Design a binder for this molecule. Structure first.
Ligand SMILES: [Ca+2]
Ligand SMILES: [Ca+2]
Ligand SMILES: [Ca+2]
Ligand SMILES: [Ca+2]
Ligand SMILES: [Ca+2]
Ligand SMILES: [Ca+2]
Ligand SMILES: [Ca+2]
Ligand SMILES: [Ca+2]
Ligand SMILES: [Ca+2]
Ligand SMILES: [Ca+2]
Ligand SMILES: [Ca+2]
Ligand SMILES: [Ca+2]
Lengths: 341, 137, 341, 137, 341, 341, 137, 137
């Protein structure tokens, strides 16, 4: 049980002490990054390099200890067991990132100024997001909106290319105020387009001829929205997903469905072997198998609807079931009354 | 292929071409299950692929074609097992598994539950690793 | 069947091999575009022109072969058959674009530097989106939100015009730091407005007099949203359309509705001819026609609701139908009981 | 115009001005169709334009005014045909068309289906181009 | 009927000829505005002034004729009748705008260069949006979201003020590259804030001291969203309003409700006079009035629900009504069966 | 009652006179802020300081009077009573802000130019939002979307860090046009990233080497949306919350639920004491307590659903209840009919 | 004020304090309207302000306090009239008004409709300006 | 802990392990409350934690474990009191509290309401501060 407690304290936290520990390690990483930023300036290079070297070595020792403890504690789960289980646990992207950070830091320390340690701590800053919880939500939403994040990233890109080419044609030969050709080549016009369709507008390149200015005015008001569309799409998707989560079915309403699914699956598995205890409730063999298959399919169909949130489909199907039962009862009452009389 | 024709023939009981809900209920009564009309309607709707309320032979072939052991079914069974499993791990205690299967859903008989426990908790521990059990099926 | 296989492999792909082929041709087009961009720079002009000429001629030969193969394979569908069917297939905008690209490339090669080949390959970059799948979604969403994409593009435009005129009046005579009149004419103020209401802000034109700065501050916080509104509207529309697609009716629930619609339409058609087999189930002629018309209208009404996703309207109408049936059964039971007693 | 008055008169059967559901059911029983109350209510609601539950003479004229051959109806019939058609093309095999029309929806008689096939699959091929068939109607 | 036809052709168009007329007049106004823009440049001032004078006089004559025709044709509606009806019609904001444009243009022509004619035609550009159809939708949506467009325009404004003051304190005394104090006074810092919290970023004012840059970095990522929030709110509101319009009740389902409402209101009105024909179906006078009041309230309650789109409230109330009716029928059947036996 | 009237007039206004008073005080504060802004400019410093001193002293006297009146009137509510009630009322953040403003203004006046009075009036500008009504909505929406405002502020931040580091590596040694190293240190690159991923784009720092420009182009189109995502998320959340408020249950449908909840809670409380009047409807003591506990839990469950808006859950549960009642009635009718016959 | 007590007393018929649906139905039967249970429930729910299903005396006073002639009611009646009015104008032909009121909703008697027409279409034209008619009420 | 076993045993009345709705109704009838089937189903669903429609002993222990005086319950009771309280303050007049508890919801007896008033409005004022009353419970 101690292994499970350690695993729960390190990965998938559920309390305040684990939250405090994770916030502390994240704050230490952030402070190390800030010190690295201050050391990148030549003014503070006198002792920032040495203090960062000491902080980096103590931090990599701490991360190695934490990683070996987590690897030992990963045996709690059924998937990670034995020797191959640890290797499968190390296959996870977060574990790969941690191992790469530790190994690269050790290599850099062995091989006194460090140049890549800034990138190493930038990568280390990713250590906070455990079990991919932050990335999974974005991945799910992008996958849901896959057919609309491509339309906005293909029509927008095509409009960008066409508008940049038109601006380049309009302002190909136009000397700026300082005598430097703004849109000398198509690459410069493409850079200007990537700067304009994203509402950045540095101001290094500005169309000069009135034709280029007119084209930029006519296209900016239209084609800019095709690049801000993914932000709105993902935001509305996040809001709708939160709203649906607000209307989730209670956790106690899927336990019977799961029990039925597991029981039907086991019955179907046991029906394969003729010498089994499942044959308690010769041509009947081909009939019981079909019945068990239909029962398994029904149980699987109900379980999926049990896990899904409440919806109009549930209301209409439940009313259909209730109406069928009521009609059967009315019919049997009428039949009994007619038979008696 | 030819076996399904024999299976379809006995369910029909009249040789018309459609497995009506009444025919399925008659077959179940012959087996001795005593189902409910709502359950029969749900089974027919799950099997039916044309929405006409009756099972056709192509629909029966489609139902008998797709089988278990697929990823979309193994994952579903694993999630169903996870529903019962507490403490987030992949181990279910034998007492919880035995208690649930005899009460919730369709109550299995004692012999069936004992066989399930023996086939699942093959090792001597008091907890059955449902992952290996699902992989066995 | 080989013609249908070729048509499915080229247009409307459904597998991985077709996906690989389309991705490969799109990547080839993109690489050609990148090489054209690098050739537009005078530094790389030595051999980029020649290698692009060779790549362009081989690519236009490949595209001509692909287009003739697609034209031959388009005969699979019923609409495209014979000689007029091929011409009708060539009327599609994507086919027109491909034909224009091929013909223009051939003309340019015949008439060794090529100036318009950059625009030709920019147009060729549109070849990836087959059957207008990318454009159809955007067109449908814009058509749905037609009454709200005009309000934001009319109030926003009017606010832009008024604010630009007010800024021009405020800063008509104000020499900048370099001695150049920023808002010399109304055209310059309009360009500044088009640059500001789109959150671009190049910085070439900035109001100088405090009146112009005050007007720009008071209007920017308000009138900018009227131009970012289309992006939010379209994003929320895309998200809601995805959510509705998540709640679509099963494909097997519309087959009986389609069958009823087709049968009723055929019965109505056959009722026109008195000598037909439809008269198996003289003044009755005027009565059967009305019955068949009503049946056809009902079948058409049900089919449209069958294709539409689940909605509260379906639940309420289905409950009304079930309640009417149940009330009829209760009434007949009561009538039979009263008649017996 | 005057013909609709004769058609409306026989449906009414009482000369009041409204075609009640009972009157429509009586007319259908005279024809010999034996409908259901739900079907009659659906027909009335489809025809009714005032929501009062009864068919008025202006409503009957409105129903008899709009007819088929419009784009909004030809497209609907083409989509209904596409529902049955597989492989994405515009050709439906004669066997599938004959099988569907005799089972799904309202089951047509054999003579009607044979006439439909003859009028639709005029050419000797085994597949009926539903596009030309819809254009014929 | 000719007056009604003229009024429908001018105001609230419903065909293609009226659409063509309105598009033509809008295009004429836009072309006049473009010519005014080109005339504002000193290069084209030679004859643009004269041609614009002629176009303006012919256009104001045309607008006067159109306005007098519309004023004559406004008598079709019941509200605009007689002399006071025309004055009430002229009270509408669009009519006021048209009258102001015509009168101001006449005054300018009487009093040859025209300076305010540019503003007059800018105002004339508003003539296209008839019956306030464009403005009504935005007004309704803003009124619906009134409690959330104030939160974003009050927290955002407060954050802007605080951040601008902090930046001013950080960079109060910091000479720029050119030797000019960027944030010399609080007004300059406020202008910088209004430029930054709106993602404009002209670049005229950029914080120089690292404290100001740090404050701008820490606040820009957070407080910018509080200013782009109104755009997202209004966009999502527009999308949801369109979705609700997609689920509107059929127009034929509210006619009985309107009839019941009008009949109950008239019955309540007639109940005031004892000598009336409404007393066909002495202390009963005080009882019939209460019954008619309750009937009127019920009819008004149903009519509002009839005009509102389909909703879960309608489903639940309709099921409650149906269940009550069914329970009453079951109870009466049971009572009759018990009484008979 | 006069104390309650004063409290309602000052806090939580509900009329027009209170609205006029609050708008007047807000306008006075805004005018004082504008005068402070004008005084920050050295041109107007001659008498603006003196007039602002007089306005500030009269305004702080007025605010002290208003605060003492509000403190006296806060005794109307049950929570604020006696001496400790006033202290608990003063613990509210708005009361703390008002007290801090008054005390700081008095201290500044006692200790003639005032430097911090600008910040004091900036803080005073927060006085308008009473009872935290503006902040509560934003806090609730952020708390609802807590798991999605962190994903966008963590993936966006990580992308910003990585992109800034890559740009710094690409353009570490690149002299600008003026001979000044743009990305001299990592701090400059981070500032450029914070300026670019927020669509600000001042133009002070622009990548020069083509590698940096390519990296900025490739990342700007993607990672910018991760920073505009919170705006869209909060906007869609606000719109959905407004839509849900449009579908709220009537206030008269929760009074019976509240009555049942209070009565069941009081019954459970009284069941603790054996000598009570609740024992009017020895081992039965352990049974009545369980019954009262279940009744209290049911009443609490219904009250929460009563306060929540209409939803599909309400429809399905209400249909289940109605169907169970109807089935019970049908069963009892059948049982009575069978027993009689 | 005191008049409402007499009105409330006769509706109660038992002197308890609540106007049950049965009591309202009894009063209506005494008048001779023969209502339906659903209509009575709707009336009670419209009048009830506490959700208890019965009318209390404060609720009766609240119902009798608010009256017509308010903007929120005049606008509603004008919109209800606009529902019938075609061609977008503010004039309804007398034939349409007379036909609708005698058929749709609750069918008024001929005398009531004649009085309504006389009071509404006071002028000799064939169309009644519903705006002035609503303003009269 | 051991006390709950005695309480669970008397509710069961058959010694099987599940408190069926019929058993709960029998216990209530023994007490003399005469409940409704819908109320019993609602109580079971509120207590049931496995969705099987019956109360198990672990579910009974879970129900008896969580109690009142928690913040999530005190706040709910305070909001329920606020529902009745007008004028936004925290004082409810004794007349309103006495009138509501004897009519709305489940009508309390006069003795219970008098005891509630005495325990709540301990001071001599005519208004009971519901905040202190809730804090007492
Ligand atoms: Ca059969
Ligand atoms: Ca079938
Ligand atoms: Ca095991
Ligand atoms: Ca009739
Ligand atoms: Ca009618
Ligand atoms: Ca054919
Ligand atoms: Ca009573
Ligand atoms: Ca009441
Ligand atoms: Ca008239
Ligand atoms: Ca039992
Ligand atoms: Ca249980
Ligand atoms: Ca008290």
């Amino acid at each position: 049980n101690i292994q499970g407690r350690v695993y729960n304290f390190l990965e998938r936290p559920t309390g305040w002490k684990c939250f405090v520990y994770h916030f502390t390690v994240f704050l230490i990483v952030l402070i190390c990054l800030i010190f690295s930023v201050l050391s990148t300036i030549q003014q503070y290079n006198n002792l920032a390099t040495e203090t960062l070297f000491w902080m980096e070595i103590v931090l990599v020792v701490f991360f190695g200890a934490e990683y070996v403890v987590r690897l030992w504690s990963a045996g709690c789960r059924s998937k990670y067991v034995g020797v191959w289980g640890r290797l499968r646990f190390a296959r996870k992207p977060i574990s790969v990132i941690d191992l790469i950070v530790v190994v690269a830091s050790v290599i850099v320390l062995c091989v006194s100024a460090i140049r890549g340690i800034r990138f190493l701590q930038i990568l280390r800053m990713l250590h906070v997001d455990r079990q991919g919880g932050t990335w999974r939500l974005l991945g799910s939403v992008v996958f849901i909106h896959r057919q609309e994040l491509i339309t906005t990233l293909y029509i927008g890109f095509l409009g960008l290319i066409f508008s940049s080419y038109f601006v380049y044609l309009a302002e190909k030969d136009a000397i700026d105020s300082s005598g430097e050709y703004q849109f000398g080549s198509y690459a410069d016009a493409l850079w200007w387009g990537v700067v304009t369709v994203t509402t950045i507008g540095y101001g290094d390149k500005v169309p000069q001829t009135w034709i280029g200015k007119t084209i930029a005015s006519c296209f900016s008001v239209f084609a800019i929205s095709f690049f801000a569309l993914p932000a709105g799409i993902l935001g509305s998707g996040f809001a709708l997903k939160v709203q649906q989560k607000q209307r989730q079915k209670h956790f106690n309403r899927q336990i019977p469905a799961a029990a039925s699914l597991i029981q039907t699956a086991w019955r179907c598995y046991a029906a394969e072997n003729p010498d089994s205890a499942t044959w308690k409730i010769e041509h009947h063999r081909a009939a019981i198998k079909v019945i068990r298959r239909m029962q398994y399919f029904v149980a699987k169909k109900k379980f999926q609807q049990a896990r899904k949130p409440y919806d109009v489909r549930d209301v209409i199907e439940q009313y259909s079931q209730g109406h069928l039962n009521l009609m059967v009862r009315i019919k049997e009452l009428q039949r009994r009354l007619d038979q008696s009389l | 292929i030819a076996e399904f024709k024999e299976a379809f023939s006995l369910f029909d009981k009249d040789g018309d071409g459609t497995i009506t809900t009444k025919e399925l209920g008659t077959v179940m009564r012959s087996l001795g299950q005593n189902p409910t009309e709502a359950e029969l309607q749900d089974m027919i709707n799950e099997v039916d692929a044309d929405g006409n309320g009756t099972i056709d032979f192509p629909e029966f072939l489609t139902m008998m074609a797709r089988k278990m052991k697929d990823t979309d079914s193994e994952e579903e069974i694993r999630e169903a097992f996870r529903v019962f499993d507490k403490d987030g791990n992949g181990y279910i205690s034998a007492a919880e598994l035995r208690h649930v299967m005899t009460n919730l859903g369709e109550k299995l008989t004692d012999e069936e539950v004992d066989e399930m426990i023996r086939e699942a908790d093959i090792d001597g521990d008091g907890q059955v690793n449902y992952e290996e059990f699902v992989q066995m099926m």
